[PDB]
Design a protein around this ligand. Structure first.
Ligand SMILES: [Ca+2]
Ligand SMILES: [Ca+2]
Ligand SMILES: [Ca+2]
Ligand SMILES: [Ca+2]
Ligand SMILES: [Ca+2]
Ligand SMILES: [Ca+2]
Lengths: 326, 322, 325, 328, 328, 329
């Protein structure tokens, strides 16, 4: 790896610093991008890795994790916490999913190429240098500009029933209203046999207040679950529920796709209950006089996990992803 | 105007067609952009002009007017209704506020120049050709990608000021807030209402509901279709609460570029001195976020859009009773 | 004008040089673009102005005029010929209709703004400095990337019948197969100068017959105006003795694309067509199953402009039909 | 492959649907582009793969294959016909040779990389998943925006048994001429019979090109015994079938030494002679400067003719073909 | 003007703040750009206006003015000093001459349009709101990315002979080594009959250490000259001269022009004496094997005022501009 | 390689031509870029490979090498000289460091991929086809638009002491005022193949450095003389008086003055100037702010400025100076 980092991850105490990722530009051939990293190590216990900003426009983890990284102290800690709140820095500056450097979706570039373009090199550092240190990974996402999402965690239905149990338990600990079992960074975590949670904590290009609340509590809840900091998870839900309701997305049927490009009007938001064969929304063809909207229907019973982001949708886009009980 | 339209606006009945706006592209020197226009004219009464999509990322108006354009029949009409739901077609196609043709904010180009670039040409067409026909104008906006907005009308001679408050009341939005298109309507002395029906780059379900109804109420109010404005509110209220934005203190401004986390949403009540939010500097380890305060009491009208804000952006605009 | 030119247009003989048009770039604040101008002046007679490359992607005028500018001798001339084969130099370098400098179609910028952006400044120079010297303008165009065109002259119906016949006469001398009755041409006309336009190809390519007709036409115009010796030569490839006068005047002449997609034509420019016959089809290759949309001609005539790009955009004309004048 | 396809290529009957290729955009991270596929399978026989739109600006395959796909009936078929008229959908939408997604010329991306950018992923789908099902591939091209081309098939000089089968398929196609990391490079590596076509260019739709292309793909199905009938290969000038030609030497290429405005003396399909003038590069930016004359260096027929008026140094402005010889 | 400013330019004391220029973006329809303005007013005397950053890539004014703005105290002042070190904020942030907002050279946009695009709007604010207050204007430039310049002031040959002499006097007071005599800012200052100095204090896309020194001292000198702060101008020159030398650029002959695009190698830098007929440099054609470079010659005796910037020059660029002794 | 070249590198005499690199454009699918290559072969001796314009905005190698390529004759030569003055032709045309074809920094692309994008395919041709013919390589660079640099040669520290002596000696013969000892660059390819490798830094600031052109033109002749390919002995006299090259080095993180913030950087020194640890390197001004004081930066090594600030507006994470110190073996 060409990405330089001087942090001693074996050292007791707190270190807050940067990994320095080389970046060549026309007027800065030897330029660097500074990726914030904080590590708190003390006492005895497991390593929790918290990442945010893998996509530049996904704010909730950037906020939750940098806030924690400023405040967390060695004497609060039994084990180790590694925090990278803002991984894809170039993309964070442009507030986009894709890299303004090489156009790549970094979360389609793992495990990476140490000699590749920026996103490939960064993917490689993450998977090869940072990740092997982790006992558990929480990679914090939202839908960015693509959809809204109802605050939630997510995981894969694992082969190993033991690992499957631990990830479920960690997700219950995290305590979002829902947990959804479903070349990404998470594919790397899973391939190394490390427990893997992701989150979906908003979107619509905006900051989700409830998403931030849920995500800040979530990462503390995981540190408590893992016994890295004192206490037990606070998992109470605003509509009365005492904890996380497990869900799944396994069926082509769970997706409402747009057949044509146009202006899509939805009938429901995320978190709302929906049933099969009924109206999901209409694609209006505002370009035409007289022409009637094209009705879309859900083809699943369940609840809306992702709902329509941009008003103007392109053929091939999902306008809704419906989740159902696990 | 260079923009051609064959519609006979004085003809009784229904005409649905297009204004043909010329556009030169590198592989289409003689290309045209087709702007939808629908006109219903029957009997006797005034002209209502309904415009939407002046900005391309402002949907609710394109939805409400295009749905009404499709369904309104001459029989229910006393007077005349002109309906252009999708004014700025190039920007509608790109989903942006600004034109992909000439880079302009068309809503900074009025009264417009018939010899100018695309947006200036189109601005001139709307003001010089279409607008002189109207007795009231309802111009439908939302905050698009810049903000979110709580469903509302807006506006700004006490007699004509009354007729405007009355038109707004009929519209029936929860709130009416006292070189744009609406500056042309006003200059010409025509009743002028705007709306702010949403934002966050998304389609607002209530914004659509409110706006679909608001436009029917305007026709009722003006005696063009039968009935009375249905102005009942979801919060209990009998109708529109008139509000104002005037003080420089109403705007919560961002002093620095960074990641803005709000404390409140649009529609929510706010007090002077309380925390509006923080700008986070995620580029830095160890750096604390910059806290921002409201300076006014009232309710959030416009609230933060993009997570990453630029120095000199507003992150909240507060309204208060008129 | 900010555009400098040291050419003395009243001096006998030959001057070949440039108008220097200021162009501010990020690494060249004081940069200039050189616009070729050749003037030949001798004896007594009228002034002929020949322009090409007003659109960067329209080649035949660039070729025909630059060729004549190189070859024409002051002893052959009685009067004055002013030759600008390559007007819109930045667009010529990008091979585009629109300016890579300010994005403008210069032929929507006349009479121009001397304090405007580059295309407006250049429009002003052409109308205010160059054009007033002219007794006749031939502005050489083609359809560039937009269409193909059958080799032809064009002109406006002048309400004044006297200038109308004078213009018809010049067009007949030019001797293209067909003459069809804020652009540069509108300026020529507002100044009471005889104005001919041409359409000598397109399809993003150089048209061999277009070049031939264009080179001959400008010689013919010189002869017509008495500026060089000889009488116009106007015989046509398909045997006709002279130009046939034509017109386009009805909305019906245009075959418009209702939808964006892949347009397949039935005829090329130059071909006779009849009302209600198939003009072609818009295929929707993004769709399985979906049948193409058939389009019809709405007039009888000869195709003047035919489909350019395979993929057409809603609102594009895919044919323009001309009829006998 | 990440490109999902529900089509069962073993099922008798007709399936017309899409390959769903992942395309992450800034406001559509889970977006898809739908690539039209139609398969017809019936009875007993070989598989014919027909592809068009590998380059977005080459129209004649998109028209001919999508037209056949809509109309061809499983009952008519003894074998299997897989039809993708519109392969490079993003480039098709932009009307460009190169991809607007990743800037790649997909026909420089084969065999492909399933973990690569969009064009690499698509190329891998085409070579790995689609292609191995074929006994013969016809990949339909034109010169798009780069040149015009005289209507023709093309193929590589190969193994006399494979060469004979390929030449026989070319003859059946019946274009006026057949000219002996691309897609066709994969077809050949796999030992599948591979035909290409060149059915126009000049950024436009070529009427004869569409006619010849439509007839050609029917003729191949007939040749293969896949549908009933015998190939119809008669030519407008009177010839009974295709005339074999070759492009083999550097001499066959007229090269632009300088950037300028190229005026040709000939078009595609026309006969030319060594030492005759090919055209002139004009320097319209200069007064006084004479245009640069270019010469042909081989006798033959123009196969590819100049496209854009403004040519760049290092561009070919003509490719001359000559009668085929069996001896290479 | 749509550009807002709450500063009371008639108030005694120091106000440091911003003009708020509206900038509509796709995700910020109601955005603003904040343009730094510092006013120091005290006692009695004339108003000095100091502007930098009219071009985003000309640094020396930005540095000198923002530094003075930070430090200058009302108690030191008799009159009024208005300081905008960073006028063209969007171009400053992109480090370009041209605006990334509307593509304009702001210095081709004066006197401006209050209803125009951003640069036209800003140009109109500066001319119509700020400039009428000034008794003297120093507008600080450098050659940015286009050239290097030898540190200097500049002015025009004014038709008003008394204002001409006052400007020459002002130039001498500024004390740069050299002072060199319609839509620019300075053209507006001159139309309003205000004393106008420009500067040229570097370029080459870099920060010129002597350019900063001379520029910082220059602006203090003008204040002393105008009587606004105490003291006598410091005009000692590094090579021993007592003060500024008046020079001029007046004829076409003064400009060495590139006839061709290529790689320009100069023989001299700014500040260097050159003679007529001597070699100015060579344009290399690195794209060619064998081709000799094109020799360019100076056509006037004098000193190089602007020297070549970019190595790769475009046909029509100036590659040297020679100044000669001033004559009234 | 898809890059075609007809030059017979084993043939005596002079061949001046082009390698033809395929470059697919929307209106030229079969387009090519011509990369100039001149080879002079005569008699008996080692092969010297001279490359310039690996970055399009680094001019001094393009001038020095194309000039030598035009003038050099087979009869003055004992061995073989291969000259590519203008390697990255598209970036040369755009006057940029990065490629306008694929946006790559070609010098982060070696050893390259013959099936990749343009810059990758060009990097492969240079390493696999041209580079193996060489006994020594001089790859001529400058700081382009990024920095200025004081005219100098450069080389890595080679663990191998005999190679180090051999490379040090070639640097001495080249005869720039300074030689600076300091994975996907072209030089790393030369090094991997165990060929003597020199770099240069002959200027920058977006401009043509007159002294840089002079030192580069002389240095390549000197290198040829050193290797015994042409007659004579190196000329190593320095403008400032010195008899030859002074060896220096860059080894410590403390050698780099880094910008912690984006802003307008005002330097205190140019390249070539002596500096002291703890003293002021310059200030980052925040011209977007009223009242705000600039941020002072300090040098953290005694020495001579090797690379100095380029752009006025610097970005957080850029170096604004790199200090070199006397060489210690
Ligand atoms: Ca994500
Ligand atoms: Ca709006
Ligand atoms: Ca034209
Ligand atoms: Ca092709
Ligand atoms: Ca300037
Ligand atoms: Ca370099």
């Amino acid at each position: 790896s060409r990405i330089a980092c001087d942090i001693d991850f074996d050292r007791d105490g707190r270190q807050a610093g940067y990994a320095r990722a080389p970046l060549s530009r026309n007027n800065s051939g030897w330029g660097t991008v500074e990726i914030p990293i904080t590590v708190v190590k003390n006492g005895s216990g497991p390593t929790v890795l918290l990442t945010g900003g893998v996509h530049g426009d996904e704010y909730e983890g950037q906020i939750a994790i940098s806030d924690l990284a400023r405040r967390l102290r060695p004497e609060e800690v039994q084990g180790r916490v590694i925090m990278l709140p803002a991984v894809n820095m170039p993309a964070i500056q442009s507030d986009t999913r894709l890299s303004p450097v090489d156009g790549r979706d970094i979360n389609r570039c793992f495990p990476g190429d140490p000699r590749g373009t920026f996103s490939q090199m960064l993917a490689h550092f993450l998977d090869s240098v940072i990740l092997p240190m982790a006992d558990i990974s929480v990679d914090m996402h939202t839908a960015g500009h693509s959809y809204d999402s109802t605050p939630s965690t997510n995981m894969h239905y694992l082969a190993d029933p033991a690992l499957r149990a631990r990830t479920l338990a960690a997700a219950e600990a995290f305590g979002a209203p829902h947990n959804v079992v479903f070349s990404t960074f998470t594919s790397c975590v899973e391939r190394r046999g490390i427990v893997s949670l992701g989150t979906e904590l908003g979107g619509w290009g905006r900051v989700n207040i409830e998403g931030v609340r849920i995500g800040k509590r979530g990462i503390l809840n995981v540190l408590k679950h893992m016994g890295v900091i004192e206490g037990t998870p606070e998992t109470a839900q605003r509509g009365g529920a005492a904890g996380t309701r497990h869900m799944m997305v396994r069926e082509a049927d769970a997706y409402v796709m747009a057949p044509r490009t146009g202006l899509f009007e939805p009938t429901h938001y995320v978190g709302e209950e929906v049933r099969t064969g009924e109206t999901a929304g209409w694609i209006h063809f505002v370009e035409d006089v007289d022409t009637a909207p094209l009705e879309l229907l859900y083809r699943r019973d369940g609840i809306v996990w992702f709902g329509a982001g941009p008003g103007r949708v392109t053929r091939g886009d999902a306008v809704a992803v419906v989740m159902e009980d696990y």
